Write a protein that binds this ligand. Sequence first.
Ligand SMILES: C[C@]12CCC(=O)C[C@@H]1CC[C@@H]1[C@@H]2CC[C@]2(C)C(=O)CC[C@@H]12
Ligand SMILES: C[C@]12CCC(=O)C[C@@H]1CC[C@@H]1[C@@H]2CC[C@]2(C)C(=O)CC[C@@H]12
Lengths: 276, 276
Amino acid sequence: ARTVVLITGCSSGIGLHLAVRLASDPSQSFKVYATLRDLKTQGRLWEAARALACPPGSLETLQLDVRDSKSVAAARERVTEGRVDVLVCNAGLGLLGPLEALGEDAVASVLDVNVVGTVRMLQAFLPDMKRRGSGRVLVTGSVGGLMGLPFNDVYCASKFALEGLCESLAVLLLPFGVHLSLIECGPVHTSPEEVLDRTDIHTFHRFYQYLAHSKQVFREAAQNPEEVAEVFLTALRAPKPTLRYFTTERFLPLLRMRLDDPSGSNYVTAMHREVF
Amino acid sequence: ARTVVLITGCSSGIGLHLAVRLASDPSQSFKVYATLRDLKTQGRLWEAARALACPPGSLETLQLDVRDSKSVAAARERVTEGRVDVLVCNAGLGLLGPLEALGEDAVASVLDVNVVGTVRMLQAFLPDMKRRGSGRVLVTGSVGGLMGLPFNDVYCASKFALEGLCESLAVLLLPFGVHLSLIECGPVHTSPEEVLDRTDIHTFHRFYQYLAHSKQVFREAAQNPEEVAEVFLTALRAPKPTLRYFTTERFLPLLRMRLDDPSGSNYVTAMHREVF
Ligand SMILES: C[C@]12CCC(=O)C[C@@H]1CC[C@@H]1[C@@H]2CC[C@]2(C)C(=O)CC[C@@H]12
Ligand SMILES: C[C@]12CCC(=O)C[C@@H]1CC[C@@H]1[C@@H]2CC[C@]2(C)C(=O)CC[C@@H]12
C-alpha cells in the first residue's frame, strides 16, 4: 500500500516542491493530497508535476482553508484511502512591518492560519493516528520560531507558538507511536507611504535598514526548495524521528548564544548589531 | 510626579497583588490603573486595597477587555495624566486538556486574549513611549512559554508566542529608551465525563496522571503572589532591565537541558519521565 500524504499550503514554495518531490518519487511509494486555500492557484503545482513526470494518480489537489474547520473536515473526507500516513502542516502567512503599522485583522489572520489552522489540522487528523498507533506529522518551522526577529513580531509570535504547540504534544505522543517533527527552515528560494503614515520616522528608517539587511542575507543564504524538501523526506523515513530537524546549521551559533543566556541580553545585543 | 502604571487582568492573582503592592508602596511613588475585563469582579481587588491601606487616589479601576481594540482605546483615554510610565500586560487565560477535546472557540479565545490582546495593548501604548523615549513594559510570562507542557498545548503555544513577540520587539526597541521585559513565572498561589467523551481512554488516563503530578508540583513549588509581584518591582527599578526576569530558578536545569539539545530529544524524554 502507498504512504498517503496530505500537505497543506501547496500553491507555492516548500509545500509545492515537497508535494511534487513525493509524488514523483522513483519508487512510487507515495500518494499525495496537495491542498490549497484557493484552487485558482493550482497551476504552478500542475506545471511542476508535469515537469517531474508525476504518474497519473500520484498527486491530487483538494481545496482546504485552514481557517475553516468545515473545510478541514471536507478535505479529510476526500482522502479515499480513509487514512493519512503523513500529515504535513505547512500552510503559513508572513507579516512584516512596524508592530503599530500592522492591521488588527492582519495580526489575527496570521495567528489563525499559522497557529489555530495547525490546531484544526491536528484535531482533525491526530485521533485516528493515536488509535492506530502510527502516523507521522511534519510541521514547517522557521528560524523565526527559535529567535525573535525585528519587524517580524507577529510572524515570530506565530512560529514560536508552533514550537510550544508541537513540543507540548510531543511529550504526550512519545509512547503512542505517532511521531511529530518540526522542520526548521532558514530563508528559502520560493507601500512605503502607508508604513510611513502609521509609524515614526526613526522606526521607518530602521525598517529600511532591516529590509536592506534581509535582502543581503537572502541573496547569500537562501536555500533551494529542493534541498529543503529533502529534509522533510529525511524526517519521514527516520525510524525514530527527533522533534526537530534543521535545514541548515547557519543559525545554530546565534541559537546557542540565545539559549546560553536566559536573561536574553546577549541575544538582543547580538541580533541588534547583526541587523542594524 | 508619580509613576503612572496601567496593569491588565487585575481581578485576581498576579495582577491583583501587583496593583495593590504598587498602590500601597510606602513612598507613594505610583498611581495605578488596575484594569479588569468585567467590573463585577473588582471586589477582591478593593478588599486587598483596603487591607494594605492604599491611599485614596493611588488605585483606580477601569474596564478593559483586551479582545476589543475599542475597549483598549477607551481605557487609554481614561488615563488622566496623559501618559503611562509602566505598562503591565498580564491578562491571560489558561487552557488544559487533550488537544482534541478543546473547543475551537476556546483555542481561538486563548490566542486572542493572550497574544492578540497583548499586541492590541502594545499598539495602543508603544508609540507614545517611543516618541518620548521612555517607558517600561512588563509582560507576565510563564515557564510554559519556555518549554512545552503536556496537555497545555494551546496555553504553551500562547506563552511561547509572547516570547517571540517580546523578543522581536526588544531587538528593535534597544536604542529607543523603551524597555520591555518578560517576568517568567513558575506555579503561583492565586467534567471528566466531557473530556472522556472527546478523547481516547489512554489519553484520558494520561491526563489523570498529568493532573496528579501537577497538583504535587503545585503543592510543593507554588510561590506566594507577593514574592512574584516583587520581581515585577525589581524589573521596574532596574536602570537597564534585561529582557527576562525569572521568579524562581527551579526550572533552569530543565530549561538548560532543553536549550542544550536543539533536536528536542533530551527534553521530550526528560519531561515525559518527569510528568509520567
Ligand atoms: C527573516 C529572514 C528573511 C525572510 C525569510 O524568508 C526568513 C529569514 C530567516 C532568517 C532572518 C532573515 C532576515 C535577516 C535576519 C533577521 C538576520 O540577519 C539573521 C536572521 C535573519
Ligand atoms: C503547569 C504547572 C501547573 C499549573 C501552573 O499554574 C503552572 C505550572 C508551570 C510548571 C509545570 C506545572 C505542572 C507540572 C509540570 C509540567 C512539571 O512536572 C514540570 C513543569 C511543571
